[PDB]
Amino acid sequence: TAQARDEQYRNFLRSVSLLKNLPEDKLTKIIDCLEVEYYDKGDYIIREGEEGSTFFILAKGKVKVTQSTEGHDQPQLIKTLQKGEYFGEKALISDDVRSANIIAEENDVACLVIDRETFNQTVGTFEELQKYLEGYVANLNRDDEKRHAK
Ligand SMILES: Nc1nc2c(ncn2[C@@H]2O[C@@H]3COP(=O)(O)O[C@H]3[C@H]2O)c(=O)[nH]1
Ligand SMILES: [Ca+2]
Ligand SMILES: [Ca+2]
Ligand code: NA
Numbered sequence: 001t002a003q004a005r006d007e008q009y010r011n012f013l014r015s016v017s018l019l020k021n022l023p024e025d026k027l028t029k030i031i032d033c034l035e036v037e038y039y040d041k042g043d044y045i046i047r048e049g050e051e052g053s054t055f056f057i058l059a060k061g062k063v064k065v066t067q068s069t070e071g072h073d074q075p076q077l078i079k080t081l082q083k084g085e086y087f088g089e090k091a092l093i094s095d096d097v098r099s100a101n102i103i104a105e106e107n108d109v110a111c112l113v114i115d116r117e118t119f120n121q122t123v124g125t126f127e128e129l130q131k132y133l134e135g136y137v138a139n140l141n142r143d144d145e146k147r148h149a150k
Contacts, residue, residue, distance in 0.1 A: 006031050013112075016057060016084055022129065026122040033118040037111050039104035045111060046088060046102040048075065053116035055123070056088045056102075061109030063087070067100040070148040075101055078147070092119055093137045099144065 009031045013019050019027065036059070039045055046052060048068060062082045066075035078100065081087060091098050114122075123129050 029122050035113045037113050039109040040107045043104045046098050048101045050098045052091045052098045055114040055119045057086045057112040058083050059110045059112050062105040064103050064105050065100050068150040089133050090137050
């Protein structure tokens, strides 16, 4: 049933520390509106420099983050992310183009995709969550500065 499917997504999303304290009604909005995208080894989920207005939660598999830096022809490997982590918030919070590539590291990667309106009405409205992601993005900014991102 729909209710059971919803309960399953609820359990997973509550396991994502970012969403652990979100009010039930906002979590429900995410559950109703999320979409799921699958990727295989090497597929670019996000490309650096592109417009983007969606937020991703990694529901299965691993992805790597690459980014163009000074003195390097090719994007450099910054980190990998795994199930339970997230990405894509920076373009929304900063009102910017995508600031790094996100690349599937293995087959059958699955991301929960949340569009801009849902993000703003859920994650952008719960003050505690917005303030947190802002600290997160500011930290990303400092990291970019350190490695001299192009
Ligand atoms: N700028 C930046 N983005 C990062 C870093 N590590 C992970 N990311 C993620 O990569 C994403 C690329 O798209 P975004 O919308 O710019 O949001 C970014 C972050 O979620 C980092 O060190 N710097
Ligand atoms: Ca699931
Ligand atoms: Ca920028
Ligand atoms: Na994360």
